[PDB]
From a paper:
Because the symmetry operations in P31 are a subset of those in P64, the crystal structures of both rhodopsins can be successfully refined in that space group. The index transformation applied was h(new) = k(old), k(new) = h(old), l(new) = −l(old). Also, the atom names and residue numbers for the hetero groups in the mutant model were changed to make them consistent with those of the ground-state structure. A description of the refinements with REFMAC5 was submitted to Acta Crystallographica and the two referees pointed out that the data set for the mutant [name] was twinned. Refinement in the higher symmetry space group and inclusion of twinning led to a substantial improvement in the refinement of the mutant structure. Averaging of the additional replicated reflections by recognizing the crystallographic twofold operation parallel to the z axis must have improved the accuracy of the diffraction measurements. Recognition and appropriate treatment of the twinned reflections (reflections related by a twofold rotation perpendicular to the z axis) also improved the mathematical model for the diffraction pattern. Refinement in the higher symmetry space group does not alter the fundamentals of the molecular packing in the non-isomorphous crystal structures. The two crystal structures still differ in the packing interactions between helices 5 in neighboring molecules that are now related by crystallographic symmetry operations rather than by noncrystallographic operations in space group P31. As pointed out by Standfuss et al., the different interactions in these two crystal structures are associated with different-sized solvent-filled channels.
Owing to their importance in many signal transduction pathways, G protein-coupled receptors (GPCRs) are target molecules for important therapeutic compounds. [name], one of the visual pigments in the retina, was the first GPCR to have its crystal structure determined. The structures of ground-state bovine [name] and of one of its recombinant mutants (N2C/D282C) have been solved in space group P31 with two molecules in the asymmetric unit. While investigating the nature of this non-isomorphism, it became apparent that the crystal structures could also be described in space group P64 with one molecule in the asymmetric unit.
Numbering used by the authors: 1 to 326
């Protein structure tokens, strides 16, 4: 063999030895070293012990603090919730699994895991588009001034959850399916079987075009455009350089949250994709394990970039923790 096609799983390990068990019945210790399986669980623990407060803290600095009612404060408060859903939904279940070297919870567990991660990535990807749009509408202003009401922010934040669920939910109902990846301690969209009863190949190419391409294409159109008013339509469009200061600061962060995304997220699809097309070309259980567990930091770093490149915020953040003020 290459790997071992099951009813609800696929493995990158030869059943020519017979040795292949199922990731819903007993240990996959036969995949790497039972020292290595601990490494997942160890990694997962820090990310659980990291995301919880650094995402809890921001989801509260804001709910508490007043002045913090700007369109960015919302989206970074939208990741603030999205991330804790990864952690208490995905991560707890994903970790607990790696100690066992296989899912104990049945596929009924590999749903949360896969789901609540797909989910978090998609709220991230979309929270960027609405962030990108915002920057376009704000920096190189189009026409007049229905300039964002706290309203338009809602319509945006609610926007992400919608779009982001139009990707994660379907595989859950059986437009696709959450299935164990790599070392079988992470679950992600069935790129493996051609399995027919879920029209697999459709959903997978669905999920790319509209939850990858398009999302990016919008992002990218706005990307460059974020260098037009940082110059001449600023030297000409007379905006007090007190605003070409705080606003040219928001643009850096956003720009960096993008890079951040593509640094973190791109390697996963590097494989996810390769798999889909070179389906059944032999490969190991570390091929898709690294990108998965790595890209899984998506539930940690955005609130931090935020403490690191947003001064007003950071100062409320210390006000909170230090009681009264700094
Ligand atoms: C650790 C396990 C995870 C993150 C499980 C599943 C992830 C996906 C199905 C990824 C979806 C995608 C995202 C979130 C962003 C880039 C496009 C994508 C389809 C690879
Ligand atoms: C092949 O793998 C299957 C399914 O995991 C398993 O049930 C079977 O015992 C293995 N092969 C043999 C020859 O028994």
């Amino acid at each position: 063999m290459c790997g071992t096609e099951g009813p609800n799983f696929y493995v990158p390990f030869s059943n020519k030895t017979g040795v292949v068990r199922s990731p819903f019945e007993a240990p996959q210790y036969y995949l790497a070293e039972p020292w290595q399986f601990s490494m997942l669980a160890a990694y997962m623990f820090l990310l659980i012990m990291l995301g919880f407060p650094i995402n809890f803290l921001t989801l509260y600095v804001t709910v508490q603090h007043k002045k913090l009612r700007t369109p960015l404060n919302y989206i970074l408060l939208n990741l603030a919730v999205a991330d804790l859903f990864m952690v208490f939904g995905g991560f707890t279940t994903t970790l607990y699994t790696s100690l066992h070297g296989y899912f104990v919870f049945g596929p009924t567990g590999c749903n949360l895991e896969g789901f609540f991660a797909t989910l978090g990535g998609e709220i991230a990807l979309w929270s960027l588009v609405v962030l990108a749009i915002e920057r376009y509408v704000v920096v190189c202003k189009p026409m007049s001034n229905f300039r964002f009401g706290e309203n338009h922010a809602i319509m945006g934040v609610a926007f992400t959850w919608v779009m982001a669920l139009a990707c994660a939910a379907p595989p859950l109902v059986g437009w696709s399916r959450y299935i164990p990846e790599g070392m079988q301690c992470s679950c992600g969209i069935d790129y493996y079987t051609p399995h027919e009863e879920t029209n697999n190949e459709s959903f997978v190419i669905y999920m790319f075009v509209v939850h990858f391409i398009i999302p990016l294409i919008v992002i990218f159109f706005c990307y460059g455009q974020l260098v037009f008013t940082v110059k001449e339509a600023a030297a000409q469009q007379q905006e007090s350089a007190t605003t070409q200061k705080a606003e040219k600061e928001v643009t850096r962060m956003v720009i960096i949250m993008v890079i951040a995304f593509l640094i973190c997220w791109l390697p996963y699809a590097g494989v996810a994709f390769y798999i889909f097309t070179h389906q059944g070309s032999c490969f190991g259980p570390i091929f898709m394990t690294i990108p998965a567990f790595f890209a899984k930091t998506s539930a940690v770093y955005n609130p931090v970039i935020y403490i690191m490149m947003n001064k007003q915020f950071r100062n409320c953040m210390v006000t909170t923790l230090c009681c009264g003020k700094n």
